[PDB]
Design a protein around this nucleic acid. Sequence first.
RNA 1: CCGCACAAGCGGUGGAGCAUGUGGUUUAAUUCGAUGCAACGCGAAGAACCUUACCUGGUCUUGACAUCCACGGAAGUUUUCAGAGAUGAGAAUGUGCCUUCGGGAACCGUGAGACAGGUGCUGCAUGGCUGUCGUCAGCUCGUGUUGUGAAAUGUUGGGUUAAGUCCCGCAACGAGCGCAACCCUUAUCCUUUGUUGCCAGCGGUCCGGCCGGGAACUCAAAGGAGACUGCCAGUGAUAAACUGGAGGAAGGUGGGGAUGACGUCAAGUCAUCAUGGCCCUUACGACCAGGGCUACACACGUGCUACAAUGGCGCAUACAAAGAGAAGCGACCUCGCGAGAGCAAGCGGACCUCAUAAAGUGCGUCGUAGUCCGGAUUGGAGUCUGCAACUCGACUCCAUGAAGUCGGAAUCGCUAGUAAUCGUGGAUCAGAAUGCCACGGUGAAUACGUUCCCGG
Lengths: 114, 100, 151, 99, 127, 224, 211, 83
Amino acid sequence: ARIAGINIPDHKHAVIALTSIYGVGKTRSKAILAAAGIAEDVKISELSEGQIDTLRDEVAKFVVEGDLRREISMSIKRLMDLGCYRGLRHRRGLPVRGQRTKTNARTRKGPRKP
Amino acid sequence: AKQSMKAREVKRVALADKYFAKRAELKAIISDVNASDEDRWNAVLKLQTLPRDSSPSRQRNRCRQTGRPHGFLRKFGLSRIKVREAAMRGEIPGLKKASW
Amino acid sequence: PRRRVIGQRKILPDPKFGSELLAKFVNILMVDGKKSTAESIVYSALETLAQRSGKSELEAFEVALENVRPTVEVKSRRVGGSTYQVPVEVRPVRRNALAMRWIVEAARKRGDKSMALRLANELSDAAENKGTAVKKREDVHRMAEANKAFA
Amino acid sequence: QRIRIRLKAFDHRLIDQATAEIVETAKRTGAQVRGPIPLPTRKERFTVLISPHVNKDARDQYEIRTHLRLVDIVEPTEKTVDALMRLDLAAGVDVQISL
Amino acid sequence: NQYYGTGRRKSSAARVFIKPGNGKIVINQRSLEQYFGRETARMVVRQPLELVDMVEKLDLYITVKGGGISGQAGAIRHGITRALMEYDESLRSELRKAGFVTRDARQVERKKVGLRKARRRPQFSKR
Amino acid sequence: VSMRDMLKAGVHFGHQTRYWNPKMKPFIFGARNKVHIINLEKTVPMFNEALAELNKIASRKGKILFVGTKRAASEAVKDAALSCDQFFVNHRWLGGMLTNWKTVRQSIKRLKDLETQSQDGTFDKLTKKEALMRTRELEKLENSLGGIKDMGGLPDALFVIDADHEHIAIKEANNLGIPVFAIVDTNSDPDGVDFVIPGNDDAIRAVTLYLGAVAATVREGRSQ
Amino acid sequence: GQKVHPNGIRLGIVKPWNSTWFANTKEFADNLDSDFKVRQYLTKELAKASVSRIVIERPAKSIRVTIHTARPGIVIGKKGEDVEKLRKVVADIAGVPAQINIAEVRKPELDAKLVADSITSQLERRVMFRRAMKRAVQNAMRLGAKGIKVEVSGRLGGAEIARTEWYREGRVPLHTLRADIDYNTSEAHTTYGVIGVKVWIFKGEILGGMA
Amino acid sequence: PRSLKKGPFIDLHLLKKVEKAVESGDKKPLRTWSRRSTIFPNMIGLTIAVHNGRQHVPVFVTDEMVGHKLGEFAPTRTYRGHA
RNA sequence: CCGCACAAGCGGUGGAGCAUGUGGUUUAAUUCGAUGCAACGCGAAGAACCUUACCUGGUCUUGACAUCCACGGAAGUUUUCAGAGAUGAGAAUGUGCCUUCGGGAACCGUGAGACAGGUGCUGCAUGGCUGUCGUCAGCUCGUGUUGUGAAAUGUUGGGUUAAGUCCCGCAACGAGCGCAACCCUUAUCCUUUGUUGCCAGCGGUCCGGCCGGGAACUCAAAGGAGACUGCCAGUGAUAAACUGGAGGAAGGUGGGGAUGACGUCAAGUCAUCAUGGCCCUUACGACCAGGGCUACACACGUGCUACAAUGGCGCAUACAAAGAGAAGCGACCUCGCGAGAGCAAGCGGACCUCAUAAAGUGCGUCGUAGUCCGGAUUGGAGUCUGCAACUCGACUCCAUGAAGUCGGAAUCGCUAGUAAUCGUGGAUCAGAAUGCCACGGUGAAUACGUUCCCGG
Ligand SMILES: [Mg+2]
Ligand SMILES: [Mg+2]
Ligand SMILES: [Mg+2]
Ligand SMILES: [Mg+2]
Ligand SMILES: [Mg+2]
Ligand SMILES: [Mg+2]
Ligand SMILES: [Mg+2]
Ligand SMILES: [Mg+2]
Ligand SMILES: [Mg+2]
Ligand SMILES: [Mg+2]
Ligand SMILES: [Mg+2]
Ligand SMILES: [Mg+2]
Ligand SMILES: [Mg+2]
Ligand SMILES: [Mg+2]
Ligand SMILES: [Mg+2]
Ligand SMILES: [Mg+2]
Ligand SMILES: [Mg+2]
Ligand SMILES: [Mg+2]
Ligand SMILES: [Mg+2]
Ligand SMILES: [Mg+2]
Ligand SMILES: [Mg+2]
Ligand SMILES: [Mg+2]
Ligand SMILES: [Mg+2]
Ligand SMILES: [Mg+2]
Ligand SMILES: [Mg+2]
Ligand SMILES: [Mg+2]
Ligand SMILES: [Mg+2]
Ligand SMILES: [Mg+2]
Ligand SMILES: [Mg+2]
Ligand SMILES: [Mg+2]
Ligand SMILES: [Mg+2]
Ligand SMILES: [Mg+2]
Ligand SMILES: [Mg+2]
Ligand SMILES: [Mg+2]
Ligand SMILES: [Mg+2]
Ligand SMILES: [Mg+2]
Ligand SMILES: [Mg+2]
Ligand SMILES: [Mg+2]
Ligand SMILES: [Mg+2]
Ligand SMILES: [Mg+2]
Ligand SMILES: [Mg+2]
Ligand SMILES: [Mg+2]
Ligand SMILES: [Mg+2]
Ligand SMILES: [Mg+2]
Ligand SMILES: [Mg+2]
Ligand SMILES: [Mg+2]
Ligand SMILES: [Mg+2]
Ligand SMILES: [Mg+2]
Ligand SMILES: [Mg+2]
Ligand SMILES: [Mg+2]
Ligand SMILES: [Mg+2]
Ligand SMILES: [Zn+2]
């Protein structure tokens, strides 16, 4: 199976296989399956290619895969170009939502550099 | 605490219970469902026009006979230290050292 | 336990079968005070062990347990200002508890993508005198009587 | 129709005395009475730091116990409801009446 | 005709009414098998009957409130024991040998100031 | 008491020749079977002259303290004191019983307070465990001062059995000037006894003879 | 080692409260502030009248202050005038009809508060502290107290190293909750600082609870 | 976010003075202390000196910064690195 | 000789992410205090403004807060302009209350000095309060006695106890402060009263204790009973006590709490308060807006969530206790995927609301993988509180899916309804809990022993 999302979903159940697309979570996958009339626990096998098409045109109703990555990239550059506080924090690689930086801000900084 | 802090507290209490009705009606207009947009907008401006110290959220509970701003108890109106002092002297009715 | 050496508490007999030692077993592998889960795992494992054994669950469990019960173990002692690694013979309830603990630990570290399954697997293994629990009992005995000097 | 009286106190001997007096005047004045039938005692609790600075761990716990009593008279003859209001009792007892 | 017994565990309270005639057991308008979804509770609630060997001669009507499943099971066991004792008064010795008149006083210990639990002390460091 | 009266009771008996005290030589008849034999020829007149003094003291309203701490003879000495309405010490002697009189008076008062309190009441107010504990303390105080609760003040005369065993009592008495009447076995030091009776102090029969004769003469001195 | 307040630990066992009114959670703090102001005013205006205790009850819509004093005449004043003069201002402070009752302490040397304030008054008139201590203890023991402890602390005699000196006479069992121990403190403001006086007075164990 | 029920927030004095400036033509930068005011579209092309605790930083209002608050474009802390 | 001190055990911390405190560095400021155990989720039971003590700038000088004196005004209420705001400049009313009718009391403003004011220094001047050894069993005194005397004895010795607990011995005898007990709570029963709580037998039912009715039971809260080594056996000086047994709901101070001796550390707190001395007075005082206390190369401490199958997810379905509520808790109903919104009942509350407990159980699914584990981070879109969520709130939806696969040396807690695990509530609080303080559910393992470690 190759969805409009150029990746290749797994062989697992459909409701979780559709979450392999960058932009589809659990709720979006459930909504896609309900819009395509497909059960959630059906594997990616035993689905006629017509069903793969009637779910590809459904997932096409969301900005997922590459287009979403571009949207995230341009929205971050918006802040990095305006000069706002969030922009400077995105530039310096520091928590942008008001978390403490005295300790344990590692996921925005990486391993400790002594 | 300093006398100026208690003075600020009593002035805030007075300003908050002087403008209570006007603030109440302005906030009602603002949060009013299906209110006219112009009426809601002018009410926001009028609300921010009133004295800042008239909002009850700017009052800080202080111990009523020392003015301490921490360790306050609403049931007694006193900080923990003065609550303990009046409790051990038997000046708080019913209050006694508990164990269970 | 410095002044009065305190005795042991009395577990009441197992609900389903009636073995106080099975009650000690289900208490031993119980995690986070979750009794019912360990109880179900034990009951399921014993039934699976019984089908291959063709023997009553209590007896096959008993023969597997005695196959793991050690009789001597090492002890760190100080008598003459030395780190005495003395081999000493074990008490009955102590060797019962050690056998149960060892088989629970070996089961937990086997995995087998289940709990009752792996527990029954290694109980049937320790029944035929083979497995890590039996391996660890033999290793304890070896460590004990490799230093027979202090007897 | 009836008269329901709730008594609140901080000490239980005082409330027992008050409810005994109330029920006794009610029984004397011809009314029919229900007994004290104590409602659950509310014990409010506070814990305060006994140390002004540094020692948060050092602290003591206080509690106020408020005791409830409920007296119900089903035949409030005007011979009785007046004498009820005329009756005055100890200071530390709250009395609440309802018809 | 009826014989009553009250039993208590950690925070539970069970009223037990015994009468002769069958082996019916009702608990809070529900059968025993559909009120206690645990075999441990099922066997601990009928230990006194199996001990005194009166399992199918007594109809039990139970009402239990408070506590958890194990607490309610233990309270019902204590109540059945007391009701059995009011029924015959000569079963007392065997029931006491089994320890069903124990009424264990164990209760959840209170939390204390400075500790994280009844006895769990917070972690401590020196260096 | 006549020499024959003593001899049948065995007053002549004494301790071993291995264990004697030097000043007792005048009072010792001799030795037999390595046993010291006390001479009744000295014993009888000295006992009679002591009985004269005891009768005199009791006939001037004297308070008499019978003293003996032998586990065998405690009850004998207690009953001896009761038979003449006097005061006794039968339990182990307490140092400062006479010299530290004030402390004994506080203990006497505490014993009186506990017995008076039990009769008056308030034991119901006390917890059942507390009331039982108070009764145990009252029993302990009685086992300690049963004889001297009613002595009131320092006694006027002392009667001592086995003066060597009770040496603290005689030292106190001499320090107070209170006279000492004592049955003195051969192993004792007779310096502390102003009216000394040399005789056996262990044998129940001779001890009871001493006590009965003394008590008869004390009642006689009281009767007038 | 710190000691629990001997009065507060016996509240409801052998000792009663100094305020005995009832109030919900909306007029509780107001009542505490009101009777704190009342007690403050009464201690200020009656510092010479040897006031021992100020009990305050609040009936339905009134306030009743009982003043336990040792010199009732000074509190009342001639013709029964000063008592009314302070009653009206107590009614002003409390904002409610007021009543003033006066209970005489027949033996002042057995009251902890009176002994303590006497000691402090002697202290700030530069009397040697041990003299006042001993005199207070002996006066209390003479009038039938079964025990008394007096402790004066803080820069005694005007030194530079503060120290604490106490003196006990009799039996003062502090761990016995059944014991009736009157305890009070006071402070003397000498030219070298504040000096703290504490007095414990044991008056015999009470059998039968608060009754 | 404030709410969609209410409107975006702005300080009254700032509103009046920016409307005066936009009707009277471009002028010197408008000095303000209202870091908490939302930038409205009628303020584009202006230059506002927003306080930052000690000095008024001049921010030239662009089209893209509409909807944000003024305080977002005048940092208050100084870091410059730990060296 | 004792103590979770070790041992025997179980679960952690140390590794990861995050929360929080501290050090450090940075900064206009990152306010001050706490610093081995006994500082480091500490003062703070809750920093967006306020709080707030710090910083920048704008301002005031008898002052923000108190008394006094003089002069002029009723008080207050509704507006306009300028200003970021403090503050400045602007109108009609009011003319109340009391009068020997002057005026006063209330309040306002101005003027003049005494003064106010200080979270400024010293906790090595103090009170008060607290920590700590340590709930460790000790600390002493009177009298007596011994010795010229300093002193000793008591308090040592033999046993025993949780204990200077108790019994013998003994020149000691007693007592005081401690120990214990008195207090609270919990485990059984009895008595009394039965509502808003209860429902055994009764009748009536819409199958709902719901309604007649019942006072039995659960329960509620007052009173009382009960446990004393009392009884039996054995050991032991016939003592103290110990070991076992009977009865009993409970047995050996039943479980827990409160209660902390003389003193120790010039221990902590002059920033709760009080206070000696010193210091400031158009400022170290006072008002205002914005900022900071939330920084970030790092180090340490206490926590939370994890790494999964004894689990995750979906559906179904059981069983709590203890609390809070009037500017409050807020049902039902409708709207929204949701946080919530609209309407609005009841409840100062055994009644109404918060409020369906979650682990559990049943059924199905996932099949050991960085996964249907984990949830960080980040983007977008929202709700609510509040003048105001940029710095810097919580929560929701959609998307995103870091590290982490059980953690070196070392180290911590715990002896039973305990550890562990699971949820619930409360204080502070407009809003803001992984902290703190409480509540119940499920519910262990082990203790041979005192040789070692630490402390006494
Ligand atoms: Mg999501
Ligand atoms: Mg934050
Ligand atoms: Mg001040
Ligand atoms: Mg606030
Ligand atoms: Mg309530
Ligand atoms: Mg304390
Ligand atoms: Mg957002
Ligand atoms: Mg481990
Ligand atoms: Mg680290
Ligand atoms: Mg870590
Ligand atoms: Mg720093
Ligand atoms: Mg700091
Ligand atoms: Mg802590
Ligand atoms: Mg300035
Ligand atoms: Mg002026
Ligand atoms: Mg000054
Ligand atoms: Mg000063
Ligand atoms: Mg100090
Ligand atoms: Mg102890
Ligand atoms: Mg010590
Ligand atoms: Mg000792
Ligand atoms: Mg000593
Ligand atoms: Mg000595
Ligand atoms: Mg000894
Ligand atoms: Mg003692
Ligand atoms: Mg001794
Ligand atoms: Mg005690
Ligand atoms: Mg109860
Ligand atoms: Mg009814
Ligand atoms: Mg009761
Ligand atoms: Mg007992
Ligand atoms: Mg038994
Ligand atoms: Mg027994
Ligand atoms: Mg206990
Ligand atoms: Mg300290
Ligand atoms: Mg400010
Ligand atoms: Mg954890
Ligand atoms: Mg969890
Ligand atoms: Mg709340
Ligand atoms: Mg509901
Ligand atoms: Mg809906
Ligand atoms: Mg709502
Ligand atoms: Mg809630
Ligand atoms: Mg489940
Ligand atoms: Mg997940
Ligand atoms: Mg993933
Ligand atoms: Mg322990
Ligand atoms: Mg929890
Ligand atoms: Mg919580
Ligand atoms: Mg718990
Ligand atoms: Mg040592
Ligand atoms: Zn002899």
